Amino acid sequence: QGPKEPFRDYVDRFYKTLRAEQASQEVKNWMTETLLVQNANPDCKTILKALGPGATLEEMMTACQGVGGPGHKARVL
Amino acid sequence: PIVQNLQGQMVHQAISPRTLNAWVKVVEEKAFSPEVIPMFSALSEGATPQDLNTMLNTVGGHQAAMQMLKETINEEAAEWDRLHPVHAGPIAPGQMREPRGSDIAGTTSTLQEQIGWMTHNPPIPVGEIYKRWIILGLNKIVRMYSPTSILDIRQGPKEPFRDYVDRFYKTLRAEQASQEVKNWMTETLLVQNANPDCKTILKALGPGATLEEMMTACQGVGGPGHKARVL
Amino acid sequence: PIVQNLQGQMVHQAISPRTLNAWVKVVEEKAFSPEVIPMFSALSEGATPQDLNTMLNTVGGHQAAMQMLKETINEEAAEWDRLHPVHAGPIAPGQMREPRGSDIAGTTSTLQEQIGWMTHNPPIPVGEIYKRWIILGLNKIVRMYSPTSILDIRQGPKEPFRDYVDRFYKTLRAEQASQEVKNWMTETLLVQNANPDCKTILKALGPGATLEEMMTACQGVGGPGHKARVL
Amino acid sequence: QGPKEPFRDYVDRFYKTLRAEQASQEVKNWMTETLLVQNANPDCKTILKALGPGATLEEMMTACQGVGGPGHKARVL
Amino acid sequence: QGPKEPFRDYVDRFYKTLRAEQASQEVKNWMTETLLVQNANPDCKTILKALGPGATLEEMMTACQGVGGPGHKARVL
Amino acid sequence: PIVQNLQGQMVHQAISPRTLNAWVKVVEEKAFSPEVIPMFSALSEGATPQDLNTMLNTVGGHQAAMQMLKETINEEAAEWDRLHPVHAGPIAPGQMREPRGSDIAGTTSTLQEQIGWMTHNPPIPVGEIYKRWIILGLNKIVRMYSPTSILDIRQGPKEPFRDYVDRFYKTLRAEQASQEVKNWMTETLLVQNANPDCKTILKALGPGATLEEMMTACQGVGGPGHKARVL
Amino acid sequence: PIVQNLQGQMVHQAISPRTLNAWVKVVEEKAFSPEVIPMFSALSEGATPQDLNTMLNTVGGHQAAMQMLKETINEEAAEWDRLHPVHAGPIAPGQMREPRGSDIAGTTSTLQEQIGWMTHNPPIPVGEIYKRWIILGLNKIVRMYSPTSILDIRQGPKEPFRDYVDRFYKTLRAEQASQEVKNWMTETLLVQNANPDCKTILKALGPGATLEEMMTACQGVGGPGHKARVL
């Protein structure tokens, strides 16, 4: 993920190439835990690390609809 | 999907490619819009579990939303399997082996066996429950999509009542709440977030006001007439 | 909808997706126009209550207007047991329950119950009544859509009769009045609302002058009744 | 109704004209209901709009009787 | 009702003398509809008249809970 | 009212003088405050309508409110006498004749007769309904006595959450709304009418916490989210 | 509460007006102070959930603590029900149901029903349990009340030991920590938080002794204001 690249584009790019997985279901789950913070840009990585381990995709998706993209307005409630 | 009754016993016919092209076009045009959720239900006919995954699997770009939805389906399927028509141990020969959470879907069920448990004895609503779980996942996706809350909608200095109302209904559509709660709020929130000029007109409408009367009251130019000095 | 005649008894099937696509596109572009109202009546042959309900729920851009229609169906359903027969409550075993006000639509009664009372016993016009109520809602939407009144619509100084008369007809569609009263109003209307250039030749056709004769005169004069200088 | 014209003169002038109209009752009732409010002066029109739809001449005149003058307030003339 | 006397002050005074009236219950109720507006000041009276005929004490109190002071935009101190 | 069981069958006794004097003083001290509503129910020990009516009849200065309460009680009696069974005119000998809506009232009933229906034939709940009607009228009075309402509550620029919530708790017993609505209102109101400094603190805590947890979060931060710290 | 036993069987008498006034006045004048907790034990002679609930509901302006306390009671009732589910559901004919965890709450069960399981059949201490739950709620409330914390206490320059020791003991009331931990803390805090002039006196007194001996020395040396200033 680039510094000006939004989180949603990065997630779509990950899921789009994950279609071509050609690998185990166990491996996909195992990768999914680390990959999101691992390939993240420095701007969004701080939040992803703050959420930390033991978080589902729904929980992370909910958190990430609050951070937005570069030059955006803050979200609160 | 399964079809035929009065002209003989039901037969599973392959879903139309025209419908698949329309689904791709709807996804390209407005993937995350709330209007997609009843459109999917409306197009769905003769629930055969295997066919229900075709809409999910033929999706283009927004694969991530479908993958998140599958985790919701898995949670619902597991909850159903363990708390509702739960079965585990031995069962008599020939029996349809009381379907498990994964077996309700095409994931661990093969088509000839699946069709067999649908047509041999009285209907089993396996596709119907699976379809309900998809609606529960779709309800989450519109919530994830939404960028504005119910309170974020306000009428600016030069913004018409018509376009203010449009935005209020658009965020209300994605609010996912009780019918009573939506109504109880609608009476005050429109008045609270309205611009001063229109707010005086709205404030004197009074309690128990119908949407039809609100539409007739707000129809004209909204010039001189009413005076709020009593509330 | 329920359909089948020549081959045997009627069977509940789904609306064509090809027709649904055609309906969706005209609704996207001509949403509040009365030209879509005959399409609704013509295409809704053999209507089943649940299927009619899907059309209302799948609304896009023009959602706010549709919410007033949702309220109207509920009020009409209530009126159907308050002004029209409430029809007791208790019923002897082996009879199909019979439809109460909310049972006319999809709100409280099931599809199996709807098909059951339309097939087992003489057909009940529940789909026709709901269709009638939806059309009544469309007439209300057209009424609220209207932006101008008969007195307000006056022909501009550079405006021709052909473009003015179109605005009068568009305005007239939303007036909801008896034909005799509309004729009675129409009689002096064209000379009353015409511009000064148009009025001199328009009133020169004789006593009153029928609308076809006014159109005939309009054809010969050309443009706003003067040659050249259009813009 | 002009700027200083009262409702009593205005309604009487309308009835003086109405009697010579020689036309069906439904047409008369239909034009009567909307015309009086529309051709009323701004000051009286505001009160007529506040009173609003429903009833017939008896209740409307009864309300107008209590309102008095050419609108605004009592203690002018 | 005086210039700066709110409805709450005025209504308490009206019921204070009604305690000592010693009259028929029907007559007291029947008189009350006219008496409340009759002894009201013109600023308060205009809004009381705007509520129209057939208005209960509860309805009048509900209106008087939103009238504001001895008439809005006029000093109370 | 009527009291006694172990020592023998029920005997009539009048209301205590300290209770009556305390009731007079509480009205002088605290007027129509919502705290008086549970206190009045506690003070009114033994529900005999004629004795309960004595508390209403001994009220001082705030007589104007009592007239509205009296009319409210008359409306409630009218509702009771109409909606619930009216019963036959004559009655079989030995029976005391069942109380009507107006029989609850002190004006229609005689005390010996009133005690009779609470000690001869099975006890009629006349006191329970008479108190219910009075409580319903007192509920209307707190709305009239209110100087502000929930959507008019707002946190000032320097106000700490303690000052803001002290005011909210004072108007809380003037809400008189359903628990379902009240829970939703409590969740929504506090965050949206908060000052910008407090909004950051509330945002940091976020949804998914108890009243105690939110209060603990507010307690720890100090002042409106920081203030003077001379240590 | 249910009064006496010597004369015969227990008799339900509503809470005394004098006790109710005294309780309401103490809450008003001392607010949310730690001293209100033993006063609650003192003014609650005879324990019945409904009567105890009425005392909480009679409180004036100071409603906020009562609302927080009410939520805490609900949690404790829920906890008792899931902690002990052994007697849950239907019971044999002749038994009056007997309390469930939620029936202990004054907002759940009825007054006659509450007395029934306190003396008409085997006594369950529901009132004493409700009092204990209230005390747990009060322990939580004094955390909110507290304005200064032990390590932030610094004795002023002209401030004497008598003000300082009083402040320390008053502050320590709301910590709810065990006596062994409190006694261990008490050993070093007194010389640590002391001002320079009083600190040397405590250092001089040194290890061993007891609070009476330390206070005896401090009381004997007098105030910090000297008449030479060797201090």
Side-chain angles (χ1 to χ4, degrees), chain A residues 11-12 15-16 19 28 57-58 61-62 65 75 77, chain B residues 59-61 63-64 67-68 72 140 144-147:
Chain A
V11 169
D12 281 352
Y15 278 97
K16 177 159 62 66
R19 293 177 168 255
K28 177 161 66 177
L57 281 294
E58 285 178 49
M61 188 63 169
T62 300
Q65 180 56 1
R75 300 303 182 212
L77 196 50
Chain B
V59 78
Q63 183 62 346
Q67 288 311 109
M68 185 187 78
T72 272
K140 298 181 179 185
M144 298 301 177
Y145 153 64
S146 192

Short mmCIF file of all heavy atoms in Angstrom, two decimals, chain A residues 11-12 15-16 19 28 57-58 61-62 65 75 77, chain B residues 59-61 63-64 67-68 72 140 144-147:
data_model
loop_
_atom_site.label_atom_id
_atom_site.label_comp_id
_atom_site.label_asym_id
_atom_site.label_seq_id
_atom_site.Cartn_x
_atom_site.Cartn_y
_atom_site.Cartn_z
N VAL A 11 -7.49 -3.32 0.05
CA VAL A 11 -8.32 -4.47 0.36
C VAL A 11 -8.88 -5.16 -0.88
O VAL A 11 -8.78 -6.38 -1.03
CB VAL A 11 -9.44 -4.08 1.32
CG1 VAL A 11 -10.52 -5.17 1.47
CG2 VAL A 11 -8.81 -3.80 2.70
N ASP A 12 -9.40 -4.38 -1.87
CA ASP A 12 -9.87 -4.91 -3.14
C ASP A 12 -8.75 -5.59 -3.93
O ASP A 12 -8.90 -6.70 -4.41
CB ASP A 12 -10.53 -3.81 -4.01
CG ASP A 12 -11.94 -3.49 -3.58
OD1 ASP A 12 -12.53 -4.19 -2.72
OD2 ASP A 12 -12.52 -2.54 -4.18
N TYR A 15 -8.02 -9.02 -2.02
CA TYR A 15 -9.07 -9.99 -2.31
C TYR A 15 -9.15 -10.42 -3.77
O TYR A 15 -9.36 -11.60 -4.06
CB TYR A 15 -10.45 -9.53 -1.74
CG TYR A 15 -10.49 -9.90 -0.28
CD1 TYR A 15 -10.17 -8.98 0.74
CD2 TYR A 15 -10.80 -11.22 0.09
CE1 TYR A 15 -10.13 -9.39 2.08
CE2 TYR A 15 -10.74 -11.63 1.43
CZ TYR A 15 -10.39 -10.72 2.43
OH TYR A 15 -10.26 -11.15 3.76
N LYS A 16 -8.90 -9.50 -4.72
CA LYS A 16 -8.82 -9.77 -6.14
C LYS A 16 -7.73 -10.75 -6.53
O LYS A 16 -7.96 -11.69 -7.29
CB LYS A 16 -8.68 -8.43 -6.91
CG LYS A 16 -8.53 -8.54 -8.43
CD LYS A 16 -8.90 -7.24 -9.18
CE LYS A 16 -8.06 -5.99 -8.86
NZ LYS A 16 -6.66 -6.16 -9.31
N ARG A 19 -8.30 -14.50 -5.14
CA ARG A 19 -9.08 -15.38 -6.01
C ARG A 19 -8.21 -16.45 -6.68
O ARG A 19 -8.61 -17.60 -6.88
CB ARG A 19 -9.74 -14.56 -7.14
CG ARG A 19 -10.84 -13.58 -6.68
CD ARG A 19 -11.35 -12.78 -7.88
NE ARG A 19 -12.59 -12.04 -7.54
CZ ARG A 19 -13.79 -12.43 -7.96
NH1 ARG A 19 -14.06 -13.66 -8.32
NH2 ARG A 19 -14.75 -11.55 -8.09
N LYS A 28 -4.63 -19.54 4.10
CA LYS A 28 -5.35 -18.30 3.88
C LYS A 28 -5.78 -17.57 5.15
O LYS A 28 -5.55 -16.37 5.31
CB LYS A 28 -6.56 -18.56 2.95
CG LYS A 28 -7.46 -17.34 2.68
CD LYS A 28 -8.33 -17.52 1.42
CE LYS A 28 -9.40 -18.62 1.52
NZ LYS A 28 -10.22 -18.64 0.30
N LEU A 57 -12.85 -9.58 10.47
CA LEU A 57 -12.93 -8.70 9.31
C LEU A 57 -14.04 -7.66 9.43
O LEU A 57 -13.82 -6.49 9.13
CB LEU A 57 -13.04 -9.48 7.97
CG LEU A 57 -11.73 -10.09 7.42
CD1 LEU A 57 -10.72 -9.00 7.00
CD2 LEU A 57 -11.06 -11.09 8.36
N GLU A 58 -15.22 -8.03 9.97
CA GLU A 58 -16.30 -7.09 10.26
C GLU A 58 -15.89 -5.97 11.23
O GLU A 58 -16.14 -4.79 10.98
CB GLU A 58 -17.52 -7.82 10.90
CG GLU A 58 -18.36 -8.66 9.91
CD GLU A 58 -19.50 -9.37 10.62
OE1 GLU A 58 -20.24 -8.71 11.40
OE2 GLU A 58 -19.70 -10.59 10.41
N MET A 61 -13.23 -3.81 9.38
CA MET A 61 -13.93 -3.06 8.35
C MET A 61 -14.69 -1.86 8.93
O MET A 61 -14.62 -0.75 8.42
CB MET A 61 -14.91 -3.98 7.58
CG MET A 61 -15.57 -3.34 6.35
SD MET A 61 -14.38 -2.86 5.07
CE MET A 61 -15.65 -2.54 3.82
N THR A 62 -15.34 -2.08 10.10
CA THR A 62 -16.04 -1.05 10.87
C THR A 62 -15.11 0.05 11.34
O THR A 62 -15.37 1.24 11.15
CB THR A 62 -16.72 -1.66 12.10
OG1 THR A 62 -17.67 -2.64 11.70
CG2 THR A 62 -17.49 -0.61 12.93
N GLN A 65 -13.78 2.22 8.27
CA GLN A 65 -14.70 3.15 7.65
C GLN A 65 -14.70 4.48 8.40
O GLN A 65 -15.27 5.48 7.97
CB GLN A 65 -16.12 2.51 7.61
CG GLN A 65 -17.27 3.34 6.98
CD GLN A 65 -17.02 3.80 5.54
OE1 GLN A 65 -15.99 3.54 4.90
NE2 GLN A 65 -18.02 4.50 4.95
N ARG A 75 -14.02 11.32 11.16
CA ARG A 75 -15.28 10.68 11.48
C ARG A 75 -15.25 10.29 12.94
O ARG A 75 -14.20 10.06 13.53
CB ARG A 75 -15.54 9.47 10.55
CG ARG A 75 -15.60 9.84 9.04
CD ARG A 75 -16.65 10.90 8.69
NE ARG A 75 -16.62 11.12 7.20
CZ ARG A 75 -16.87 12.27 6.59
NH1 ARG A 75 -17.30 13.34 7.22
NH2 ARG A 75 -16.72 12.33 5.28
N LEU A 77 -18.89 9.67 15.30
CA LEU A 77 -19.99 8.89 15.81
C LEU A 77 -20.53 7.83 14.82
O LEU A 77 -20.64 8.11 13.60
CB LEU A 77 -21.11 9.85 16.26
CG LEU A 77 -22.20 9.25 17.18
CD1 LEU A 77 -21.63 8.48 18.38
CD2 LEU A 77 -23.12 10.37 17.68
N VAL B 59 -19.84 -12.43 -9.02
CA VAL B 59 -19.48 -11.04 -8.74
C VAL B 59 -18.13 -10.63 -9.34
O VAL B 59 -17.19 -11.43 -9.42
CB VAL B 59 -19.49 -10.80 -7.22
CG1 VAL B 59 -18.23 -11.36 -6.54
CG2 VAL B 59 -19.67 -9.30 -6.91
N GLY B 60 -17.98 -9.35 -9.74
CA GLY B 60 -16.75 -8.79 -10.28
C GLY B 60 -15.86 -8.22 -9.20
O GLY B 60 -15.39 -8.92 -8.31
N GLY B 61 -15.54 -6.92 -9.29
CA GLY B 61 -14.65 -6.19 -8.38
C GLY B 61 -14.73 -6.43 -6.88
O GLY B 61 -13.73 -6.79 -6.25
N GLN B 63 -15.27 -8.42 -4.44
CA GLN B 63 -15.10 -9.74 -3.86
C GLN B 63 -14.92 -9.74 -2.35
O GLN B 63 -15.41 -10.62 -1.65
CB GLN B 63 -13.86 -10.42 -4.52
CG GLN B 63 -13.53 -11.88 -4.10
CD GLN B 63 -14.65 -12.87 -4.44
OE1 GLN B 63 -15.79 -12.53 -4.77
NE2 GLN B 63 -14.33 -14.18 -4.38
N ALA B 64 -14.23 -8.71 -1.80
CA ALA B 64 -14.00 -8.55 -0.37
C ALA B 64 -15.28 -8.49 0.46
O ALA B 64 -15.40 -9.15 1.49
CB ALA B 64 -13.19 -7.26 -0.15
N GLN B 67 -16.69 -12.06 0.55
CA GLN B 67 -15.90 -12.83 1.50
C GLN B 67 -16.21 -12.53 2.96
O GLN B 67 -16.37 -13.46 3.77
CB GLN B 67 -14.38 -12.71 1.20
CG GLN B 67 -13.94 -13.48 -0.08
CD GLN B 67 -14.47 -14.91 -0.12
OE1 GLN B 67 -15.35 -15.26 -0.91
NE2 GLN B 67 -13.93 -15.78 0.76
N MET B 68 -16.44 -11.25 3.32
CA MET B 68 -16.91 -10.85 4.64
C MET B 68 -18.30 -11.42 4.93
O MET B 68 -18.57 -11.96 6.01
CB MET B 68 -16.95 -9.30 4.75
CG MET B 68 -17.32 -8.77 6.16
SD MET B 68 -17.56 -6.97 6.23
CE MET B 68 -19.22 -6.97 5.50
N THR B 72 -20.15 -14.24 7.91
CA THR B 72 -21.48 -14.07 8.51
C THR B 72 -22.37 -15.28 8.25
O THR B 72 -23.01 -15.80 9.17
CB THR B 72 -22.16 -12.77 8.04
OG1 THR B 72 -21.81 -11.69 8.89
CG2 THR B 72 -23.70 -12.82 8.09
N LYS B 140 -25.41 -5.79 6.78
CA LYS B 140 -24.11 -5.33 7.25
C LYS B 140 -23.33 -4.55 6.20
O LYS B 140 -22.75 -3.51 6.49
CB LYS B 140 -23.23 -6.50 7.74
CG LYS B 140 -23.85 -7.23 8.94
CD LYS B 140 -22.94 -8.37 9.42
CE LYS B 140 -23.51 -9.12 10.62
NZ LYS B 140 -22.54 -10.11 11.10
N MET B 144 -21.62 -0.87 6.41
CA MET B 144 -20.20 -0.65 6.11
C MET B 144 -19.98 0.41 5.03
O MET B 144 -19.10 1.26 5.14
CB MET B 144 -19.46 -1.94 5.67
CG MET B 144 -19.42 -3.08 6.72
SD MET B 144 -18.63 -2.67 8.30
CE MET B 144 -19.00 -4.31 8.99
N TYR B 145 -20.83 0.41 3.99
CA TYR B 145 -20.83 1.37 2.90
C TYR B 145 -21.10 2.81 3.32
O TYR B 145 -20.47 3.74 2.81
CB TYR B 145 -21.83 0.87 1.80
CG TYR B 145 -22.47 1.92 0.91
CD1 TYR B 145 -21.69 2.71 0.05
CD2 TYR B 145 -23.86 2.12 0.92
CE1 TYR B 145 -22.28 3.68 -0.77
CE2 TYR B 145 -24.46 3.08 0.09
CZ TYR B 145 -23.67 3.86 -0.75
OH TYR B 145 -24.27 4.82 -1.60
N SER B 146 -22.11 3.02 4.19
CA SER B 146 -22.58 4.34 4.60
C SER B 146 -21.50 5.30 5.12
O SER B 146 -20.69 4.90 5.96
CB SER B 146 -23.68 4.20 5.69
OG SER B 146 -24.34 5.45 5.92
N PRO B 147 -21.40 6.56 4.67
CA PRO B 147 -20.35 7.46 5.17
C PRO B 147 -20.96 8.46 6.12
O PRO B 147 -20.22 9.12 6.85
CB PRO B 147 -19.85 8.14 3.89
CG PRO B 147 -21.10 8.24 3.00
CD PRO B 147 -21.85 6.95 3.33
#
